[PDB]
Design a protein around this ligand. Structure first.
Ligand SMILES: [Mn+2]
Ligand SMILES: [Mn+2]
Lengths: 48, 48
């Protein structure tokens, strides 16, 4: 579950990232997004 | 403040990351940590 909990925060994280991106074209914001998306696939992979 | 709010979630994120790392030697967990740490410096840089 610890792993679910992180998958949960990350998923909460991106949304807020994506919110900013509805409004501002800030490439560094889009670049964090991309890592978290990676970050979230590893979680899913290791959750099975 | 939107930027503070993200700096805030990230900071909340790592802690939970670091918690797992007190217990488990999972290199992929340590590798996320590292990105978020980057993720957090960009925030600080852009917060000024
Ligand atoms: Mn992440
Ligand atoms: Mn991050």
């Amino acid at each position: 579950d610890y792993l679910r909990e992180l998958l949960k925060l990350e998923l909460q994280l991106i949304k807020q990232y994506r919110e900013a991106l509805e409004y501002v074209k800030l490439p560094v914001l889009a670049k964090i997004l991309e890592d978290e998306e990676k970050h979230i696939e590893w979680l899913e992979t290791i959750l099975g």
